[PDB]
Amino acid sequence: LFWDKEPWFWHDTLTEQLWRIFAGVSRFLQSISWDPEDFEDAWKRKRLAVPCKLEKMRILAHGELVLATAISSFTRHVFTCGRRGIKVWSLTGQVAEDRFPESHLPIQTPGAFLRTCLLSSNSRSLLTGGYNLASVSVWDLAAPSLHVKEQLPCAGLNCQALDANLDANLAFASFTSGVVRIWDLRDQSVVRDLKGYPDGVKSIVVKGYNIWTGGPDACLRCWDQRTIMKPLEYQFKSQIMSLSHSPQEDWVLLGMANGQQWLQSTSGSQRHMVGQKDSVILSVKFSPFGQWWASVGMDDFLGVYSMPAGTKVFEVPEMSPVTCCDVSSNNRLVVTGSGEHASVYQITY
Amino acid sequence: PQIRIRPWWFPVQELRDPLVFYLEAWLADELFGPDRAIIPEMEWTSQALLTVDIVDSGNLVEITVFGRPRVQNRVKSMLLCLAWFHREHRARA
Amino acid sequence: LTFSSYGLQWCLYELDKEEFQTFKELLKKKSSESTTCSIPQFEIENANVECLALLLHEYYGASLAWATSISIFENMNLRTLSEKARDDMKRHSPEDGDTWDYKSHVMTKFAEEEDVRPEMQTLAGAFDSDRWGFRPRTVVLHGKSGIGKSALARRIVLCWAQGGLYQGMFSYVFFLPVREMQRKKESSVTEFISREWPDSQAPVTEIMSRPERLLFIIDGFDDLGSVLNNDTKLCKDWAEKQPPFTLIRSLLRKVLLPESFLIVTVRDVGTEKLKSEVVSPRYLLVRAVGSLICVALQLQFNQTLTGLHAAFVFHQLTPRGVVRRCLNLEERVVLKRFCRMAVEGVWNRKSVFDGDDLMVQGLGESELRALFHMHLSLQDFCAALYYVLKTKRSMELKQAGFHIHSLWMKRFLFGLVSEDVRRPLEVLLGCPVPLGVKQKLLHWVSLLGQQPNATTPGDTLDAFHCLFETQDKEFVRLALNSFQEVWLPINQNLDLIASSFCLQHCPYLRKIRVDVKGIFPRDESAEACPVVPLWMRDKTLIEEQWEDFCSMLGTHPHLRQLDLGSSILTERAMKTLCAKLRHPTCKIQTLMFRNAQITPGVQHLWRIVMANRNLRSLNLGGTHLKEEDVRMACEALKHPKCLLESLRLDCCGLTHACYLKISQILTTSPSLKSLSLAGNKVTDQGVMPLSDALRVSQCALQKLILEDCGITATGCQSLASALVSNRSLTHLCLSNNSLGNEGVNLLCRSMRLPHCSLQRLMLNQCHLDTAGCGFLALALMGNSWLTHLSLSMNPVEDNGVKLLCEVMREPSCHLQDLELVKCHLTAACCESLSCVISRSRHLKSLDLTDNALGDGGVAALCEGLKQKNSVLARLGLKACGLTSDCCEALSLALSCNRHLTSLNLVQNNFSPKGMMKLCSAFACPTSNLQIIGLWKWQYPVQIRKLLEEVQLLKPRVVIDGSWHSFDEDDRYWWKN
């Protein structure tokens, strides 16, 4: 696309020639693939292999700054978020750059923004929230027509982080008043309220009965839902930007906003640096199978790292700062967001 | 002219090149039920759209599948296997 | 019952073939241990995915089978598929006056102007609520162009006028035609509501009184989009006058009159343009190709559809009442103008032609109607016939290049180069036509051919479809001259016809693979279809055309290799394929069946080995072989006419008697020079017969691969005695076996003799250590035959490598290629290796991957390579933690050194200055590096252009990130 001098397809040249005739006046980019049999990556000489290659294959134009992204591979669509609304794209067609979304969901209300979004693991619902809005809404995607099905109330609150757990039917959210609220999707009723810290918590991670939260105060805390026990605090030297949780093994990945990554274990207080940069990490995302992770930073770079020690397999440069990334469940596609655009790469290994 | 609802997630492009095969009327009756209330769930899980119709004589049922050709072949094989199970079950009793 | 098994089958389709075998064996163990419910073993083995899930529900029951499958999935270490199965279980397991006058006048109006020029239940339910619970305001209809959307909308307004449809909901109907909206530059809804009524005066308060009472119908949104493409601010006020496109946009965005409810009729391209505008709609699909085809058949070129369309159009173009009359000049001019207007319609994506444009073109209406009888298909055909006979860059170019509807035009354009359809055109016009579009199409297909990668499967299928449409032998040959190997998936019968016709005409075809799934006829028993007759169920045209494909695969003279990427073969299919491959005229040498599922048809395989003289290699993998199968294989190999030189068995699961028979044929068969048993269980009771077979002097086995066999030290000593006895074996592979230092010592003792005649030995993941490395070092001194040694993924430490280097520095050693990976090295190791490289002479290759050499080690290796005496050819570095200083030193070394050719530097952190130094060293004429390992795109644009400059200088150099590029095929071909 942008990196190449000019992206062309195989029928595009014949179309150009026929247009020239009418008007009287490798080399070919490929489309993305879904079938495992056509993936055909040669054996090295479901799978825990570390990737080895990247190639950009589409560009999405949103018309304004991009705040958050999400990608589904069971259903091919992609979701982009901005301060005015949410746009749904489709990855089934073939084109270098697309301007025509599959749908647009606008939010019109005096002084109503958006900041966050979240897609459920089964691909059947989507959570939305922002500033000065009445409540956090959920959308039903399995229906023959998109529509809101529930409304999770919050009065005079400005949310900044969302998370959802589907096995127990819970929903989580954090607000700028240092309050974390829990809701039940069966009753849409508030369950339990966590409070006591003024700065708030920028990122939240939920697995099992543990809630991990960290923010500019340079501390990480663990809350338990079963009891009302006080959280356990681990002190660091810099402010946390993002968090993620290793699915297979007990390891919490966190970025320190001074270009330093760490791993922390729930069972014991062990730490060890796994990477260092001169930038500020704005996001860390973790692969579904747990063997690698992606990191996007302020100094215009997308990097892929290796779990055992943190060695970086490779990286890609970009013109404008990136602020969000997301990895598919097939472990083959990854989507980042910079400027007013979102780009789609493919993973081959 | 026949008018059918289509979901928002099924792209218009895939509507091209449908697949057609016939089965018995009663056999389709136990497969789908007299109400056909399971078709939306099957469509969502398979990401493909089906359609069941009955000939005026009431002997044959025409089934059409929308989607990529491998998906159509897979769904056809699955339905044929279930049809054989029901036929042999009827033969047993 | 079915609603619960369907989900389980859809979950089990995710598992791989080896995963499927693991699932089957775990299910076997669970069934055998349990006594409450019994599952037969052969019934489990014979079952595929669908039969497995169906049987599991049939025996266990629904919830029990779902729970068992989830448990096995969690056992196999799969945790995402388990969650998906749990959710699918949660869902699939069942729970346990004036208005009357206005409407009458509207009725009269559209009755008059429809005289000038079932589904009702669905249209009545269009505004009902579904089972989810939802009331849609906007309803969008799309469908085929044969139906009249205007007629549907007008019949809707009719049924409202009588009142049998939507009687209680709303009180008003406004019908908006879009062309008439375009007629007036300035328009507002006030003018329209005044226009529709007879009196032309309406109470605006009554109109704006209530939301529910109003319904709008918008027709033909696709017919005009150019004005709508302009962006203007939406109008909140209804009364204000604005351009009509702004009103339509504001009405569809629901900013204007947000409370009322709409309905829109559009086409496919229209809905592609429209889906971004509407909010939360309800899409309905409505569904003259068949009538057109039958009429064209009436007025008859059976081979292709383009022949039929050409027959129709050329019959029509004949003068009425006259046969084969030459066209006059005016008729040719009007025909050309007709075709030009058709191509303008195709490029601009509009199938409705206005009167003013036709006036601009200048063709008469009567002559036009004489030229055309009815369609988009005829529009595409006439566009192609134009190609037979504005703005520089326009949106219409990218629109018509989307090639959903341009595909028909392109297909007809390809089909028009055929002579059988050209001659009627020649006799009709009376003049000869030269055309360069043939040259353009030929160049296009050839340009597909010359791509360096193997041809893309979809591109190959499309190209074969087009060339099959063409139907010219020489044209096909010139088109396919460029390429040699293809990749051909097949999903339908027409694919078998097209490939069968088109692949006989590739003159230089050498390699091919095929992916064949679902095409085989429904099994004649247990899968009868009421629609499919006995001819369709058995002896189907699909069977005959499969036979023809197999025949043309066999008879091809220049084909050497036949591959099956992934296929599901019926036993009749393999019977036919093997019957075609038996005949001696076949010339195929290498067969590969590792990924294909071919289990039912294996009993027919051995006859081609017995009979076909030219067959050399054969590969099987992941298949299950019965004892009768192995006995037949041995009997076929024992036949003197066999010349099969390579046989590979993988994960077959053979029995002890099978190893006995294998040893017997190893002693017996003269031709067999290679044999691989990788992944099989091989007990020491199976190793001993192999040693006994190798001890005999008649054995001529040169290669032997044993991977994951799980042999022990007793196997080591048996093999050691056999090696002492034998003198034919040369290559030996024993990897991923826990031999230990004791087995290493045994092999060391047997290799210590000067009579050992093996040249290559590899031992990876063999749990070696410093002691075993010392044993190997002791054996290495005084030995001259052994040339290659590889010890990877073994913690052979610094002291072990120092022992090896001390032994190998001696002049009498003749070790050439030594590669070691993941051996926990350091800098002092590198200094010793540098001394060895500078001093020794016979060493040519080296490898150091996944070791933390650091900067000092690379500096020492630099100092070693600086010497002119060194003759090291290739060096492999990766994940060694390199930085700026070491890369500067390496740059100076490559500046000074000459003999080094290949190199590799990936997964290292290089600053821009260091890469500047590396490029400066690379470009120097003193250094001649022919292969370099680096990723180009990982670096900034300045570095990318600098590497492009370094590439344009010295055009021999090749920069590719994936190393092992253009490497010798023997090194990797031996191993497996």
Side-chain angles (χ1 to χ4, degrees), chain A residues 1-4 6-349, chain B, chain C residues 1-322 325-530 533 540-965 969-976:
Chain A
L1 271 294
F2 197 57
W3 178 76
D4 269 343
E6 182 71 23
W8 276 91
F9 286 86
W10 187 48
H11 294 84
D12 206 358
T13 184
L14 176 72
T15 299
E16 180 69 25
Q17 289 327 291
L18 283 186
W19 161 258
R20 299 292 180 90
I21 301 299
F22 161 63
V25 179
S26 63
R27 289 275 80 81
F28 294 157
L29 177 62
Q30 295 297 289
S31 63
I32 62 171
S33 55
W34 310 102
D35 300 332
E37 53 174 15
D38 283 11
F39 190 72
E40 286 291 325
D41 282 18
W43 172 56
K44 191 260 182 183
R45 284 180 292 273
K46 179 174 283 291
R47 188 75 263 169
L48 279 79
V50 177
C52 61
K53 185 67 172 67
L54 264 180
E55 67 273 19
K56 171 156 70 174
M57 294 177 71
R58 199 179 287 247
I59 279 285
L60 309 170
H62 194 266
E64 65 183 1
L65 270 73
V66 172
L67 294 173
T69 55
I71 178 169
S72 166
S73 66
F74 178 53
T75 52
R76 281 75 177 272
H77 309 94
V78 175
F79 303 87
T80 319
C81 181
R83 304 177 83 233
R84 298 292 183 184
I86 292 169
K87 308 179 93 169
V88 184
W89 309 89
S90 184
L91 300 183
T92 182
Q94 79 163 66
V95 65
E97 182 167 354
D98 218 341
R99 282 83 65 193
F100 297 153
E102 187 70 24
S103 293
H104 180 60
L105 312 175
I107 297 169
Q108 204 282 310
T109 297
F113 309 164
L114 290 179
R115 294 178 65 88
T116 71
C117 176
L118 182 134
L119 175 72
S120 296
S121 299
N122 53 3
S123 295
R124 270 178 166 259
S125 66
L126 188 153
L127 270 77
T128 303
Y131 282 14
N132 294 107
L133 172 58
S135 59
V136 164
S137 177
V138 304
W139 299 80
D140 177 44
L141 314 185
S145 58
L146 282 177
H147 61 274
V148 171
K149 73 203 179 183
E150 292 167 5
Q151 280 264 326
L152 270 46
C154 59
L157 302 181
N158 310 347
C159 68
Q160 53 188 353
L162 292 173
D163 197 304
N165 195 359
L166 61 83
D167 63 358
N169 302 334
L170 277 297
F172 300 81
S174 162
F175 300 98
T176 183
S177 61
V179 162
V180 192
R181 279 189 173 174
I182 320 183
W183 295 296
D184 173 25
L185 276 71
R186 280 172 280 142
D187 291 344
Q188 298 91 17
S189 64
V190 184
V191 164
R192 186 267 183 275
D193 188 359
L194 301 83
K195 65 178 72 66
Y197 304 120
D199 65 345
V201 288
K202 282 181 37 83
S203 296
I204 61 167
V205 181
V206 173
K207 183 202 281 181
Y209 318 103
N210 284 108
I211 297 89
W212 296 85
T213 61
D217 55 17
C219 302
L220 167 68
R221 298 177 177 92
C222 187
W223 311 78
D224 62 358
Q225 286 158 207
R226 294 181 294 173
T227 61
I228 298 169
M229 187 66 204
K230 303 291 97 175
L232 290 84
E233 61 185 3
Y234 315 110
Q235 179 75 39
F236 289 76
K237 299 289 95 175
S238 182
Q239 56 181 6
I240 299 97
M241 294 298 102
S242 185
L243 303 175
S244 195
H245 204 275
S246 179
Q248 297 288 99
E249 184 178 1
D250 187 86
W251 284 115
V252 177
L253 185 45
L254 57 83
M256 294 299 291
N258 56 11
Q260 296 184 3
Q261 311 188 352
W262 298 70
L263 297 150
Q264 164 76 233
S265 59
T266 314
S267 296
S269 296
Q270 294 75 315
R271 308 172 188 175
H272 64 279
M273 185 180 288
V274 298
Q276 188 274 331
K277 296 194 284 186
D278 53 353
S279 172
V280 171
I281 297 90
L282 300 169
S283 295
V284 287
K285 182 69 165 65
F286 208 85
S287 175
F289 285 121
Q291 291 303 128
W292 61 267
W293 75 82
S295 175
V296 299
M298 183 177 176
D299 197 357
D300 304 332
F301 269 125
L302 163 67
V304 175
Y305 289 58
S306 295
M307 186 66 204
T311 308
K312 52 184 290 291
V313 63
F314 63 89
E315 79 186 9
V316 172
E318 272 145 15
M319 38 183 276
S320 294
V322 297
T323 58
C324 65
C325 66
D326 189 358
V327 184
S328 171
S329 69
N330 266 349
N331 209 358
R332 291 177 175 178
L333 301 165
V334 56
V335 174
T336 185
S338 60
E340 300 178 355
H341 304 244
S343 52
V344 184
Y345 310 98
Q346 192 170 5
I347 301 299
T348 57
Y349 54 87
Chain B
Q2 283 75 236
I3 297 169
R4 183 179 182 271
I5 184 68
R6 59 158 277 263
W8 76 270
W9 38 261
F10 193 86
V12 187
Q13 324 165 9
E14 277 78 357
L15 293 160
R16 184 175 179 268
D17 282 346
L19 188 153
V20 175
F21 63 98
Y22 301 174
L23 294 181
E24 290 296 327
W26 60 270
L27 183 141
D29 199 359
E30 70 274 15
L31 284 148
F32 306 111
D35 200 285
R36 272 78 165 176
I38 52 178
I39 309 306
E41 293 83 3
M42 301 190 330
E43 288 183 353
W44 168 264
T45 188
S46 174
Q47 299 265 278
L49 318 179
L50 283 75
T51 293
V52 186
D53 285 329
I54 303 169
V55 72
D56 55 352
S57 81
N59 299 54
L60 271 300
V61 167
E62 173 178 7
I63 298 90
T64 61
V65 189
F66 289 151
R68 313 195 314 280
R70 61 175 297 151
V71 181
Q72 314 177 47
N73 299 322
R74 174 179 300 197
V75 166
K76 170 149 165 31
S77 66
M78 294 177 71
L79 269 296
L80 267 295
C81 168
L82 282 164
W84 186 250
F85 183 112
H86 275 292
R87 188 156 40 255
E88 67 89 23
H89 185 196
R90 180 189 180 92
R92 289 175 61 247
Chain C
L1 283 72
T2 74
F3 185 57
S4 64
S5 75
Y6 182 76
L8 201 56
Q9 293 179 357
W10 183 257
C11 289
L12 291 180
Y13 288 162
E14 202 278 338
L15 287 170
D16 207 333
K17 192 165 54 97
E18 72 165 28
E19 298 290 336
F20 195 50
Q21 291 302 111
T22 312
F23 185 85
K24 291 173 74 171
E25 66 183 1
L26 274 295
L27 187 67
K28 198 183 307 296
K29 178 167 70 69
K30 293 287 187 180
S31 69
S32 73
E33 282 168 336
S34 180
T35 64
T36 61
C37 176
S38 67
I39 314 173
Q41 300 332 311
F42 64 92
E43 182 65 26
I44 292 169
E45 291 292 328
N46 295 315
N48 50 359
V49 168
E50 312 165 359
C51 293
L52 181 57
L54 183 141
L55 183 63
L56 190 70
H57 287 171
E58 206 274 328
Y59 279 160
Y60 265 46
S63 69
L64 209 45
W66 281 86
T68 303
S69 306
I70 297 190
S71 83
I72 304 186
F73 289 178
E74 181 61 28
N75 261 350
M76 305 194 266
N77 220 328
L78 321 165
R79 82 149 190 77
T80 75
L81 183 46
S82 73
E83 274 167 21
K84 161 159 145 51
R86 198 157 313 119
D87 272 343
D88 294 8
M89 182 179 72
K90 188 183 297 293
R91 174 171 65 257
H92 282 87
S93 175
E95 191 267 331
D96 291 329
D98 59 276
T99 47
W100 206 270
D101 193 73
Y102 156 71
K103 77 207 273 166
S104 66
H105 186 273
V106 169
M107 183 278 288
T108 308
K109 284 194 290 181
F110 58 66
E112 291 156 7
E113 76 175 4
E114 78 178 4
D115 300 330
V116 160
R117 185 67 182 271
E119 311 87 39
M120 321 301 167
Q121 278 69 16
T122 310
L123 300 163
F127 283 106
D128 282 348
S129 87
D130 45 355
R131 65 181 294 276
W132 284 259
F134 186 52
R135 318 206 72 113
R137 301 268 66 185
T138 185
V139 166
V140 183
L141 296 98
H142 54 270
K144 58 98 174 181
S145 310
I147 197 67
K149 304 289 178 60
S150 57
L152 191 65
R154 294 175 65 88
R155 290 176 65 88
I156 289 170
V157 178
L158 182 63
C159 295
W160 179 76
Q162 290 84 19
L165 184 150
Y166 278 148
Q167 59 272 18
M169 296 201 42
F170 63 89
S171 288
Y172 274 143
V173 173
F174 292 168
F175 187 100
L176 286 165
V178 291
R179 282 85 60 91
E180 281 72 359
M181 295 298 102
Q182 273 291 291
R183 294 298 179 271
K184 291 179 282 294
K185 188 263 281 173
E186 285 286 325
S187 172
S188 179
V189 69
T190 47
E191 286 83 319
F192 187 98
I193 63 175
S194 70
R195 186 257 293 273
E196 295 269 329
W197 290 15
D199 48 350
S200 171
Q201 287 77 59
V204 292
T205 64
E206 191 276 332
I207 301 299
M208 294 298 102
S209 66
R210 272 90 51 79
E212 184 80 29
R213 308 284 104 190
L214 295 174
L215 168 69
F216 300 97
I217 296 89
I218 296 92
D219 186 7
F221 178 85
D222 58 343
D223 300 332
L224 61 84
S226 83
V227 188
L228 295 161
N229 287 319
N230 197 358
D231 312 320
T232 53
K233 296 294 184 181
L234 307 179
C235 52
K236 292 290 190 71
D237 285 332
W238 63 295
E240 182 65 26
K241 292 177 71 68
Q242 289 288 316
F245 85 96
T246 298
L247 281 72
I248 301 299
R249 189 182 181 92
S250 302
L251 192 65
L252 278 175
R253 298 291 183 184
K254 298 301 286 184
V255 164
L256 180 67
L257 296 172
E259 293 179 353
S260 182
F261 56 104
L262 294 174
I263 189 167
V264 173
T265 52
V266 71
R267 275 173 58 241
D268 44 43
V269 288
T271 197
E272 182 65 26
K273 272 302 200 94
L274 170 60
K275 67 163 88 86
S276 307
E277 323 293 331
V278 300
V279 286
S280 178
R282 175 170 290 185
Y283 300 99
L284 276 67
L285 172 68
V286 182
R287 65 174 290 158
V289 179
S291 68
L292 191 140
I293 287 176
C294 68
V295 167
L297 282 151
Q298 291 150 24
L299 273 296
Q300 290 302 95
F301 293 156
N302 65 322
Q303 62 280 13
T304 50
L305 73 165
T306 190
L308 180 137
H309 286 184
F312 204 66
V313 164
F314 294 165
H315 196 171
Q316 296 294 321
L317 265 292
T318 56
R320 280 68 176 190
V322 180
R325 170 71 66 228
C326 173
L327 294 200
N328 212 345
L329 188 153
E330 69 275 16
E331 315 177 73
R332 285 195 285 117
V333 171
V334 298
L335 185 61
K336 192 177 289 183
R337 293 177 187 273
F338 190 10
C339 291
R340 185 167 180 81
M341 182 201 54
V343 311
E344 293 179 353
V346 160
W347 286 109
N348 306 316
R349 283 164 69 183
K350 53 187 294 296
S351 171
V352 176
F353 310 121
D354 294 327
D356 50 358
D357 305 347
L358 192 151
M359 295 298 102
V360 175
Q361 194 68 41
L363 73 164
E365 307 91 5
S366 64
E367 308 95 302
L368 163 72
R369 175 63 188 86
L371 297 175
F372 83 93
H373 197 241
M374 283 73 74
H375 209 289
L376 59 89
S377 74
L378 276 296
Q379 172 164 17
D380 291 331
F381 179 95
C382 287
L385 196 56
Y386 164 79
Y387 291 102
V388 166
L389 291 158
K390 266 71 66 178
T391 59
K392 184 71 172 179
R393 184 237 68 84
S394 161
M395 284 73 74
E396 325 300 330
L397 193 163
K398 70 181 180 66
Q399 287 181 1
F402 182 76
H403 78 275
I404 48 163
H405 57 97
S406 178
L407 189 68
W408 293 97
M409 182 179 72
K410 294 188 177 347
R411 289 300 190 88
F412 286 122
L413 185 51
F414 272 91
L416 271 161
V417 304
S418 176
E419 197 271 339
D420 62 335
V421 301
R422 181 179 301 285
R423 66 98 182 171
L425 188 153
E426 179 72 25
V427 68
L428 191 47
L429 267 75
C431 303
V433 58
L435 59 84
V437 289
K438 179 175 281 191
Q439 297 175 358
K440 302 265 197 173
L441 307 168
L442 183 63
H443 173 49
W444 187 56
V445 179
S446 294
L447 180 48
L448 172 77
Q450 285 104 26
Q451 289 284 141
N453 295 328
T455 70
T456 301
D459 297 335
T460 304
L461 196 59
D462 303 347
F464 279 169
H465 272 309
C466 283
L467 275 296
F468 173 65
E469 199 74 23
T470 286
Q471 304 266 321
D472 291 331
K473 295 178 175 66
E474 292 79 3
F475 180 83
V476 176
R477 297 180 194 271
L478 294 174
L480 314 168
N481 195 293
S482 171
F483 63 87
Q484 313 281 300
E485 69 275 16
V486 304
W487 187 350
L488 186 84
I490 299 186
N491 297 122
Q492 280 148 25
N493 189 179
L494 302 176
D495 297 346
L496 273 73
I497 287 154
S499 309
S500 172
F501 170 84
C502 293
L503 262 184
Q504 313 196 142
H505 299 324
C506 196
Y508 302 149
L509 179 69
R510 304 275 292 219
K511 306 189 287 185
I512 188 174
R513 77 183 72 186
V514 290
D515 292 331
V516 177
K517 293 185 291 296
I519 309 157
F520 304 117
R522 226 3 189 223
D523 182 21
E524 286 73 30
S525 298
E527 281 94 6
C529 179
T540 312
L541 208 52
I542 198 62
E543 305 189 8
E544 199 278 307
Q545 293 176 353
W546 180 247
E547 165 160 334
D548 186 69
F549 190 71
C550 287
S551 295
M552 61 79 70
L553 271 181
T555 313
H556 195 264
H558 206 175
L559 181 68
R560 267 79 166 88
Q561 174 174 358
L562 188 152
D563 187 355
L564 277 79
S566 293
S567 304
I568 301 299
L569 271 300
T570 301
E571 61 87 19
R572 292 181 67 190
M574 275 271 179
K575 155 171 302 193
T576 307
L577 175 60
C578 289
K580 296 286 110 175
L581 271 292
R582 279 183 296 176
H583 182 74
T585 62
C586 173
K587 210 168 292 297
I588 297 169
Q589 293 176 359
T590 303
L591 292 168
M592 185 180 288
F593 291 165
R594 65 181 294 276
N595 291 351
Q597 325 194 342
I598 62 170
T599 302
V602 175
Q603 63 251 42
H604 299 294
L605 196 146
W606 314 118
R607 190 97 74 87
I608 70 172
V609 175
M610 183 177 177
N612 195 5
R613 278 85 164 85
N614 206 298
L615 175 74
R616 293 286 187 268
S617 177
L618 170 56
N619 188 355
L620 309 158
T623 183
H624 195 111
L625 288 171
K626 197 181 175 181
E627 293 179 353
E628 290 290 331
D629 297 316
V630 174
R631 187 182 64 79
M632 287 279 111
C634 308
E635 190 277 331
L637 267 293
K638 285 180 184 179
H639 182 74
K641 298 293 183 182
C642 192
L643 280 73
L644 187 136
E645 271 164 14
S646 179
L647 179 49
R648 159 167 317 253
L649 306 167
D650 264 341
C651 301
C652 293
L654 296 94
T655 300
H656 195 271
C658 285
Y659 293 100
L660 189 140
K661 299 178 178 68
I662 281 172
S663 295
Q664 299 202 310
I665 62 170
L666 195 149
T667 64
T668 310
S669 60
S671 311
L672 191 67
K673 295 198 294 184
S674 174
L675 184 51
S676 171
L677 295 172
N680 294 350
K681 61 94 178 176
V682 178
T683 51
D684 296 308
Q685 293 58 33
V687 174
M688 294 182 286
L690 299 184
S691 176
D692 291 331
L694 274 295
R695 291 180 79 86
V696 175
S697 75
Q698 293 179 356
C699 70
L701 196 76
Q702 293 179 357
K703 303 176 184 290
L704 176 80
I705 298 101
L706 299 170
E707 192 83 21
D708 314 333
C709 289
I711 78 164
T712 55
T714 58
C716 304
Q717 63 84 30
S718 300
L719 288 167
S721 67
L723 268 65
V724 176
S725 72
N726 191 2
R727 293 181 184 271
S728 180
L729 188 153
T730 299
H731 300 65
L732 177 75
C733 167
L734 299 172
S735 278
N736 284 301
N737 285 344
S738 65
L739 293 203
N741 291 319
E742 47 268 11
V744 169
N745 192 7
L746 294 166
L747 277 296
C748 176
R749 267 207 295 240
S750 298
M751 293 182 286
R752 176 65 265 175
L753 306 177
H755 296 285
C756 201
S757 65
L758 63 91
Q759 293 179 356
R760 292 177 172 171
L761 180 69
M762 65 179 288
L763 308 159
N764 311 300
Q765 288 265 74
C766 275
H767 299 105
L768 266 71
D769 200 359
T770 64
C773 176
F775 292 141
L776 273 174
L778 186 61
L780 188 65
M781 183 177 177
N783 194 3
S784 86
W785 272 59
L786 185 143
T787 304
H788 290 60
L789 175 76
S790 88
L791 312 156
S792 303
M793 294 182 286
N794 291 336
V796 166
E797 294 294 328
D798 291 331
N799 44 6
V801 168
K802 291 177 70 68
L803 275 180
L804 264 170
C805 290
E806 199 72 85
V807 168
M808 182 179 72
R809 198 157 62 81
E810 196 263 319
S812 79
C813 185
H814 296 347
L815 191 70
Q816 282 177 354
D817 172 79
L818 165 77
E819 62 86 20
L820 57 86
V821 167
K822 279 289 292 293
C823 292
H824 305 64
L825 300 187
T826 190
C829 176
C830 295
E831 191 272 345
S832 189
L833 282 159
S834 70
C835 297
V836 172
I837 289 158
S838 68
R839 173 79 270 178
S840 73
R841 208 271 298 165
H842 269 286
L843 184 78
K844 294 295 285 183
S845 170
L846 188 69
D847 179 316
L848 293 92
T849 298
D850 291 331
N851 306 311
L853 316 182
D855 292 352
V858 177
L861 268 165
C862 182
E863 182 65 26
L865 286 172
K866 188 187 286 186
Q867 322 298 292
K868 64 182 181 293
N869 189 359
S870 66
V871 65
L872 191 67
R874 48 182 272 175
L875 181 62
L877 267 71
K878 192 163 69 148
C880 287
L882 302 201
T883 59
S884 191
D885 291 331
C886 67
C887 82
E888 182 273 332
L890 188 153
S891 81
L892 182 57
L894 317 186
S895 177
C896 296
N897 166 273
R898 187 268 185 190
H899 295 285
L900 182 77
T901 73
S902 177
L903 197 60
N904 190 7
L905 296 97
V906 190
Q907 276 93 14
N908 287 292
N909 189 359
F910 285 124
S911 67
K913 300 175 72 175
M915 185 63 72
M916 186 66 204
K917 299 291 177 66
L918 260 61
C919 298
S920 176
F922 276 15
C924 183
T926 313
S927 53
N928 63 6
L929 290 164
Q930 287 69 241
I931 288 173
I932 310 177
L934 273 173
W935 285 125
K936 277 183 176 290
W937 35 260
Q938 172 173 345
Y939 296 102
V941 70
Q942 164 168 55
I943 302 312
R944 281 192 289 270
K945 65 91 177 178
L946 183 63
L947 277 296
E948 289 179 356
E949 169 183 358
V950 172
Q951 160 79 84
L952 62 83
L953 278 169
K954 294 181 176 67
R956 297 285 75 78
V957 70
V958 167
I959 297 90
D960 203 328
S962 66
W963 199 53
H964 319 125
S965 85
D969 49 14
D970 193 10
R971 159 198 320 272
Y972 281 10
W973 165 232
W974 179 64
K975 183 181 74 66
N976 51 8

